[PDB]
Nucleic acid binder design. Structure first.
Length: 184
RNA sequence: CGGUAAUUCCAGCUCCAAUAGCGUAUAUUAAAGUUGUUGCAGUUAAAAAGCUCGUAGUUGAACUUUGGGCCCGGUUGG
């Protein structure tokens, strides 16, 4: 089972979570149907303030639309089984380097593989249930940048307590500071 | 400027400027932001074409690897 729900089974933490999938799939006749085709590729643990950790789960991008039907419940369940964790799902995306004037030619680089485009999609996935309603960028006199992301005040209670963990996760993946705000 | 009564003509004194050199004519440069790339002007002083379309010419919005770590590291100053 486990090596057939992982796209590879190299390490034990994925085996723990893989088991939880198999367990939960039995506990309800509903999940027995929905969860069966899903798979995930890798997991990374990122430490954050207050001693907690983020379970960043990486998913094949053509299947991402499936998880969005089951991402609720799954977060409820997994945060019980792995006590003191925050769980978030991310699609894996390529990024291709920018061509130099010296390089030999290759097929034209699709715009979705640019670095700017990929980082925007990452941020969209973190806050998944809510929509982003705007962005700001601040250029401080010290010579450094901060982004502010504004969230739709809808169902925010599902993520309202996680925001500090999102800041830490995003920094690890990119090196960029962000803060979250919720317009009334 | 000069028609008597001359600070301007003519002469005599005195004085000034450059000086082995000084003056005149013609051309050209600066002065000239009176040819304007730097850098002009066009209500009333010279100068916006009766009006619109349109080829050559001149000109044309934004976007694609950014940021963060670790070594070596030359020059100058204390």
């Amino acid at each position: 089972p486990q090596a057939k729900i992982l796209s590879q089974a190299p390490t034990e933490l994925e085996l723990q979570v893989a088991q939880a999938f198999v367990e939960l799939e039995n506990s309800s006749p509903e999940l027995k149907a929905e969860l069966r085709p899903l798979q995930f590729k890798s997991i990374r643990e990122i430490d954050v303030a207050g001693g907690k950790k983020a379970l960043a789960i990486f998913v094949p991008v053509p299947s991402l639309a499936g998880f969005h039907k089951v991402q609720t419940k799954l977060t409820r369940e997994l945060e019980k089984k792995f006590q003191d964790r925050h769980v978030i799902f991310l699609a894996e995306r390529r990024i291709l380097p920018k061509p130099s004037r010296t390089s030999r030619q290759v097929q034209k680089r699709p715009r979705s593989r640019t670095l700017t485009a990929v980082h925007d999609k990452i941020l969209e996935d973190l806050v998944f249930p809510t929509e982003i309603v705007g962005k700001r960028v601040r250029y401080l006199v010290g010579g450094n940048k901060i982004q502010k992301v504004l969230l739709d005040s809808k169902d925010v209670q599902q993520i309202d307590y996680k925001l500090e963990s999102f800041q830490a996760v995003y920094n690890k993946l990119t090196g960029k500071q962000i803060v979250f705000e919720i317009p009334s």
